[PDB]
Amino acid sequence: GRKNLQDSLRTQEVVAQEQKDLRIRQIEEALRYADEAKITQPQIQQTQDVTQDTMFLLG
Amino acid sequence: KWTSTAIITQPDVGQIAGYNNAMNVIYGQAAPKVSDLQETLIGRFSSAFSALAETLDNQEEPEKLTIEPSVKNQQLPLTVSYVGQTAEGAQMKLAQYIQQVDDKVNQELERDLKDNIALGRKNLQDSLRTQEVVAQEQKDLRIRQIEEALRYADEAKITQPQIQQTQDVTQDTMFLLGSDALKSMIQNEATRPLAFSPAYYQTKQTLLDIKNLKVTADTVHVYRYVMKPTLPVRRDS
Amino acid sequence: SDALKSMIQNEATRPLAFSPAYYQTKQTLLDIKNLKVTADTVHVYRYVMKPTLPVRRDS
Amino acid sequence: KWTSTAIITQPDVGQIAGYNNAMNVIYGQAAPKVSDLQETLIGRFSSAFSALAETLDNQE
């Protein structure tokens, strides 16, 4: 069971890394788009946990 | 010449639990039923036992293996008996024959289990492939709406925010976000992350577990020994 | 007016309004085309007893 | 001269399940009911088993 569990935790890290890498790509695309739109500044004085779609408000 | 006896009872309930879980995943909604699994295991043994017993009965040899309920001393379950021509031999053969039948069924169960898995791999692989197409199509439509919106915006005379807070909205209203952001999305249309169907991601989770999966079908038994074969002092035939 | 003109100018393209029947049609088509079944590993019988000892009589 | 016997019982329920589930879910009122699937499988099993026996008796 412990051998299984150690394997499972290992495979799971690989899936996490792939997702982590994909989100970082979406962030790289969002920056060029935000500059292009002419938002190079915060549209809110606040900061919040924010999805890709509403991300642009961060500046 | 000499009758050696052994006493047996029920299946090992625990051992099959993993076979039952796997079977539920593969078959799913269609329903493999619990009932049919009990019938498939019990059937491999039944059919196989009867045949061995059959072969022994027909030959003009005194090698007679029989089953009926009989008493132990403290439990009444099934008593199995074998008549051998030497006492030591009746005890050895009886052990060997119950076991040999255990091995036969376990190999038939392992064999069917393989068959279940192979059917599941064709089905998963085909579903996964189909699911991507529908998602990519739906996506291609949403991209089209982003294009339509841009055209609408350039006519509408809104090229910049009429709404300060960004949100997702359909092509008729989208233009209010402003043309400039819309122009970029179209320009970089290809890189955008691919859309997933609620079914698709589920499929991937299931496949992901399936490769991890542990299951037994070589150490399962269909009987347990209450009394293991003993050396006889009975000269009944 | 500005939006309303754009819609008329690009009248042809406009999305299609679809009934529940459309989604049911694609749903049913997708589902038959995946399906697989059994064809030789299916039995409709079980043996309580495997053919046995000939010394019996019947008519 | 010498007669062989076998004893049989119910169908293997899990294996037919898919055929029945798919059929009802996809078609609805339009193709066979769970009852009608059942009736049809047995009507077919029963007519064939009996027909082999019938031909066989009639032979001497």
Coordinates of C-alpha atoms in Angstrom, one line a residue, chain D residues 8-58:
Chain D
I8 CA -29.3 -25.3 -16.2
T9 CA -30.5 -22.2 -14.6
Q10 CA -30.9 -18.4 -15.3
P11 CA -29.2 -16.3 -17.9
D12 CA -26.0 -14.3 -17.1
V13 CA -27.6 -11.2 -16.0
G14 CA -24.7 -8.6 -16.2
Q15 CA -23.7 -9.4 -19.7
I16 CA -27.2 -8.7 -21.3
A17 CA -27.5 -5.5 -19.2
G18 CA -25.8 -3.2 -21.6
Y19 CA -27.9 -4.3 -24.5
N20 CA -31.1 -3.6 -22.5
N21 CA -29.9 -0.3 -20.9
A22 CA -28.6 1.3 -24.2
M23 CA -31.8 0.2 -26.0
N24 CA -34.2 1.9 -23.7
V25 CA -32.1 5.0 -23.0
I26 CA -31.6 5.8 -26.7
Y27 CA -35.0 5.0 -28.1
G28 CA -37.6 5.5 -25.4
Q29 CA -41.1 4.5 -26.4
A30 CA -39.9 3.8 -30.0
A31 CA -37.9 0.5 -29.5
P32 CA -38.4 -2.5 -27.2
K33 CA -39.2 -2.0 -23.4
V34 CA -37.1 -3.7 -20.6
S35 CA -40.1 -6.2 -20.3
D36 CA -40.3 -6.6 -24.1
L37 CA -36.5 -7.3 -24.3
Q38 CA -37.0 -9.9 -21.7
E39 CA -40.0 -11.4 -23.4
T40 CA -38.3 -11.4 -26.7
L41 CA -35.0 -13.2 -25.4
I42 CA -37.0 -15.9 -23.6
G43 CA -39.5 -16.3 -26.5
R44 CA -36.5 -17.0 -28.8
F45 CA -34.6 -19.3 -26.3
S46 CA -37.7 -21.1 -25.5
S47 CA -38.9 -21.7 -29.1
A48 CA -35.4 -23.0 -30.2
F49 CA -34.8 -25.3 -27.2
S50 CA -38.1 -26.8 -27.5
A51 CA -37.8 -27.1 -31.3
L52 CA -34.6 -29.2 -31.1
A53 CA -36.2 -31.5 -28.5
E54 CA -39.4 -31.8 -30.7
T55 CA -37.5 -32.8 -33.9
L56 CA -35.4 -35.3 -31.7
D57 CA -38.5 -37.1 -30.2
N58 CA -40.0 -37.4 -33.6

